[PDB]
Amino acid sequence: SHMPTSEEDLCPICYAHPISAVFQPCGHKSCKACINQHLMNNKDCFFCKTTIVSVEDWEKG
Ligand SMILES: [Zn+2]
Ligand SMILES: [Zn+2]
User: Which of 7, 37, 39, 50 is deepest in the core (most CB within 10 A)?
Assistant: First the structure.
């Protein structure tokens, strides 16, 4: 499936889990499980493939 309208802030890469991590200084966001698994392959910012300098925990409240 490819749906822009999600039930919550659900990570579009995964659907099952929401966003919890921001990829600075770009600001693109996804689930923590994304980047941790991605560091076994690359260090790029997924949706634009920019170099992630810092992976911080994006608080939603
Ligand atoms: Zn980006
Ligand atoms: Zn994800």
Answer: 50
The CB density around residue 36, as the number of other CB atoms within 10 Å, is 11
Which CATH number do you get for residue 20? 3.30.40.10
Domain count, the chain: 1
Nearest ligand, CA of residue 14?
2
61 vs 57: CA distance, rounded Å: 12
Method of determination is NMR
For ligand 1, the distance from its centroid to the CA atom of residue 24, given in whole angstroms, is 8
